[PDB]
Amino acid sequence: SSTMSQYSRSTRSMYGPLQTPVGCVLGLVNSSLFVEDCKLPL
Amino acid sequence: ARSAIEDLLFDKVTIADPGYMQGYDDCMQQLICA
């Protein structure tokens, strides 16, 4: 949360950030699970 | 992995890579940078 712009961040559910191949994620849990039919693929 | 036919196809054609993994970092500390 150090160097942001626009309006501040909204976070409640305190939970370290996780490094994903697409980037760095917050609000997620590590889980080695496999689903074929993701309604909302990240 | 990538098939050799598509290996040739991918390498021969001019591809600029839009940084899937850390491409932002690849121009902060080192076109698809601007």
Ligand SMILES: *[C@@H]1O[C@H](CO)[C@@H](O)[C@H](O)[C@H]1NC(C)=O
């Ligand atoms: C999940 O944990 C494994 C090892 O426990 C690690 O290699 C992987 O990077 C973690 N996933 C994320 C998104 O950080």
